[PDB]
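WP5 quarterly update. Target: anti-sigma F factor antagonist. Source organism: Bacillus sphaericus. Length: 111 aa.
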Amino acid sequence: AFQLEMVTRETVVIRLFGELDHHAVEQIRAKISTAIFQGAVTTIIWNFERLSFMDSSGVGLVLGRMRELEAVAGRTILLNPSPTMRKVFQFSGLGPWMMDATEEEAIDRVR
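Structure tokens (predicted):
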């Protein structure tokens, strides 16, 4: 399961819950890619805290949206990754985008 909450103007928290299979990955990709293109989203906070696991294609989901954001000088935050997700994202050098904090601390930072 997942939530796409527009916590504040053009900032979306992608909240992940339990398993994220490839149908769900595709639902997120379509909605959020469109939102970036339209300018409705310029900051994504990925909250991985309560993700159990996700399809293989979820890594690409994140990385693809990072490239779409970079184009509009958008911001990406990887919040509270589990050991598997921290490993896969560190492999791609994304340490600088990963952080461990409360969701409110992360959101308030980008306010």
